[model samples]
Target chain A: KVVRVGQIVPSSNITMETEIPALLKARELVAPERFTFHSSRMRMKHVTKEELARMDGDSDRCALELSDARVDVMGYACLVAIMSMGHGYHRVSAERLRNVTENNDAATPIITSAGALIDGIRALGAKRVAVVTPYMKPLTELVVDYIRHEGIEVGDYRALEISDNLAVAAHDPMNLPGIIASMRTDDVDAIVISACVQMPSLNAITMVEAQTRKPVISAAVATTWAMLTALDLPTRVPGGGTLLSGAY
Target chain B: KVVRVGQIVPSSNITMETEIPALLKARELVAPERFTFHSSRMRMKHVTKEELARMDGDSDRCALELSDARVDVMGYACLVAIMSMGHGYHRVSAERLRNVTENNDAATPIITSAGALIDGIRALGAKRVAVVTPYMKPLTELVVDYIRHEGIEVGDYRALEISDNLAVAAHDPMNLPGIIASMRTDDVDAIVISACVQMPSLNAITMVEAQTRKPVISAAVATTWAMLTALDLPTRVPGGGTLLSGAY
Candidate 1:
């Protein structure tokens, strides 16, 4: 069987399209389902509150467009955009977008990266999580505070202070191992190698999990898991960290 | 060094983002450059000519968005969108989109998959080529005629008659070899495995080449070759068939 995966992505953000599809395609090796990815972009260049808010307003149109193709599930990428709005905004955004799809008679399930990150951490049975993000310190604090409000503990976090959205994507996943080494992983139950979906971190998930012996998850990884669960398929994707090993 | 590869893709297109990045990521293993991908989407859900023309009109907006990130090179993906317009429309589209980026002060190079296929065939030193497409027979004929107008001889072709754009992408690449076996490929100098960018063909290029002993090139492969050529980088990407073997 073939599943059509839809994404409502930021125009400048590129990693989600590659990383999400990569993870799903990897699942094809061990699973019976085949997937075809589809996306509709929202215009946002800078990773700022103003631009993100404006981009969020365009989600209705993107959702409606993806519903035209009748995708099996639609993923709302850009975690910061959802989290920056306020606490529990992913649920609001997802509900509103679901209405858009439902209005179009498609009624496709909607998943958000922000919600996925929370779901992923909970799936790993982690309470205290060390997080990393590409946002500035101020915005990063907002994201951390939002997570804390979700009943999860933020032990320690690092903000990379990257404002350019594309630059965040261009940041190499290879550099992530060193960054995680400096974070206080000893006290945390899980490591969020990339809290923001714009950052490329899939390549580092397995290596870090091996080194720290702790579960590693990112917005992209969480989003993939959410997609697979929505489709009711096996989540055993190779090279995906502990969460995707079918343990959860 | 890093190269920012940009693509103006149909919102439903998932193959170019995956295949282009797959080839470039493969190049990174044997080359020194690291690449980041970016995309801006035009709304298109069907393979009809009416929808294609309207989609082509949105290319300028997509180009302007990609330029905001200052992408080094932009590829206008959607082979039939260019080919269906008329003869040599890829050049017109590329020049016009390049002008859009230049006006934005980015001055990026634009490559169209339609033009890339013709260029890829010539680069293989092939005079006559067999082609395969997911378009209906009438639309497929437009692509063949557009290709023939470029001064290359068309030996044989097959149309799979798929109308839904997402369905076109969902068409399995593994079925391509059997389809080619039924086509008149013996007298052809090269095989255009998947003429449309929306069709996934990257996984079959190498296998088809070994089976037929004739070079296999797809619109995605040609677009990658053109992007590498524009970047002045070596195109020795493994599993990319002869065109990307750095032969030309």
Candidate 2:
């Protein structure tokens, strides 16, 4: 019987490990003993399309290692990071990773945060949105364009232009209200607090919605919701946002 | 100056897209006017190590296409699928995609979900775990052994032996309570409810915890936390679990 969950994440991401598990723990969802994490490094001082493309090649290597770890399900956490590359990359990444498990005589399931985010948005029937991100100007622009391609209208957006992901990860959620205050508008139906996975935004979700009276979403929130739905779990969560509250 | 976020996801994934974006939206983070989704195929009939190795090579072609899209940051979203192969595969995968992007004069930041997961876990100071997975028996064993190499102990485990990734994804969270109820024990510090990203565990997390009174974590939950933290958002979420609600 397999009773553990393992994750493969970026070496530079400190927030995800802390926040995701914490989310589950807060809900008293899964016990701490059931989860574990594995990591790989994909550090880049400067991000570009070419660099992003190059990163795709790394999935297999990471998957192979994670397979050895024998995680029940391995997740690729970066959403914008993958979408920035182009069309149909997530499936390719998943396939490559699955192949690694098969080769090792261990077949494991795979999922990506990027894919989960999209699925969640679609599930919510969101067709247009405004977003915020911690990426630099150029990378943020690419993220915008990628989202547009998904058939969602981008009403407005902002980028913090934080070059270092680790630095960005260190930001305070208490300040998110101010950040949302600076970025709020009536043009969009939904607000994306932290477009990049490297940034945090769980606590600010409900506050954002209460203040704006509009649907609020975040990468982490959407991913968790979608995951629960996929697993056939309850849609209601206690603290995160309307989505978790099961109001929607 | 730039804004917005986009993603490429696996066709089989029912989560990432929604989860990731929700993480961003909950913070009221708004961005530019475009969102796009690119998907590829991954049919995981069996979860084996060798098959995973073969899939690694298949990703090259897809990377080329994503490179053409010229995204800002590209993420390869398979965790165990890649980890099952070996060490340094992420680097190799990143390098390969880089070559393509360079040929097109597009440089982008690269990230992987697997790398992000591992990084997230280590950040949380978790070294020992009890895991749960939707994979068959053989693959589950391999996953456990892999974690052992990561300098962590697998105190106990349960494998659902679900071969189809889609079927696993379609599983009901309500049923998870029974499964988790069966696995409760005192020796474990944490529990991994959903090992594969493809298998969703959003709802079961809290139920498992209520039953086990131990920390519960899942691939989806961990990935969301890692992604949010990477972006430097807030870790505090309200309803999901203790992980999101408790800490920084």
Candidate 3:
């Protein structure tokens, strides 16, 4: 009894394409009979403005193609792409994608890493948050502005100034905590350790959550919550992070 | 049992405004099980290519509102609006609508009349198709190209070229015969009497089919097929076209 999950992801970004499958593996580890993961691509490597614009069009076509795979939920796994598009962009994109799935004989839940992160932030009852990302300077400015527009203040943030898209995927999880430590958490309600999936903080999410003793989450953890909450499945995963400790 | 059907219709269209409820009402006219059709409006007055594009954005919101009705099926009932966005627009739109419905705990099937028309055209075993539309020349061109992109051929076509969308609903079903008669030929396999739902064509489908000896389908006929087929209900609605007259 496997639950199929579909992903619409950038061709170059490796985090979501990696983290989501790993999270599902953990779900399968905890509840082997009820979980699995699958994906389709949306082709973009750079998280820059022009590249983001190019990546947006293929989602519907990718969605239609994935519908053939019989997925129960589909996630658009780019955090800044949607957030950078506009505030409330996720709701519209989610609604648009579901129409495609439902009309094709199934209406599944759609999750965007953008929507999931906002949801993850709110679910933790955190209004002011700290974030750490591997985005290039321009993209990080957009992400900060995006979160601000979503009604959350960026209490503190650190951008590793990495512009090579695939290079972010090769990031060491051990290095994320130092960046997390650099943030001004004295004013933060929660911490977003990996603001985007391209930033590999899945392994660091739990570590820093304990170190910061704040409700900590990453794009991947929030995305798993999106899929699970959409399916009304368990929100618990051992060593996952505070965001997945229970039903939100 | 009363099956619930939901529609996200353009606020200005008259044919779908009158015909869809009538189509579902026909269910009780012929059989025991009945259907209740619910609709949410997308606000737009004219039917220009620009307005069609503007109206497309309202679909996800309308779909979200209709999902609250706990509908059994959702129909993205505006064909040209969806088509004007591009070919295969419904696939993405339908999936997006479903994400809203499923998240609300109503994981029902969704049907796009755009998709249903393609399905209807294919089901007729016809490749060289003739089309009639109330759209402007540019929009008619888009619709023709959309169908062709979907793997159907448009040998001949007519655009009533109505800009005031309200006027399209006021179109007499009687006027369709002469128009369709002009478009039909020895090479044409089937006729789409009205490609845009704003034009009244449901009542004229059987008459047109009778005249041409070809399966005459309209957006309404295809829409009815979409709703019924998604539910696996009998296809034979009283005045819908051959698409709805067959054994599903």
Against the true structure, whose DockQ is highest?
1
Native-contact recovery for every candidate? Answer: 0.31, 0.00, 0.00
Query: Order the candidates by TM-score, highest first — what do you get?
Result: 1, 3, 2
On the 0 to 100 scale, the lDDT of residue B21 in model 3 is: 64
lDDT of 3: 0.75
What digit string (tens of lDDT, one per residue) describes model 3 on residues B2-58? 576666666544466457766766667786876544555565667776777887887
Clash totals in order: 0, 240, 24
Give the TM-score (vs. native) of candidate 1: 0.80
Which one wins by lDDT: 1 or 3? 1
lDDT tens readout by residue for model 2, A35-148: 323333343423456665566566676676545444556667676668776766666776777788789666877777766656656666777788888887878777778777
Against the native complex, each candidate's DockQ, computed on alpha carbons, is 0.28, 0.03, 0.01
User: What is the C-alpha lDDT profile of model 3 across A163-182, one tens digit per residue?
Assistant: 76657876788988777887
Overall local distance difference test of candidate 2: 0.60
Better candidate number, 2 or 3, judged by DockQ: 2
lDDT of 1 by residue, A1-248 (tens): 97878888887777887788778778888988877666677878888889989999988888876777677999999888888899999999989999999998779999999999999899889999999998999899988999999999999899888998768977988888989998899999999999998888999999988888889998988999998898788889998899897847
Best by TM-score: 1
Weakest 10 consecutive residues, lDDT, candidate 2 chain B?
A: B32-41
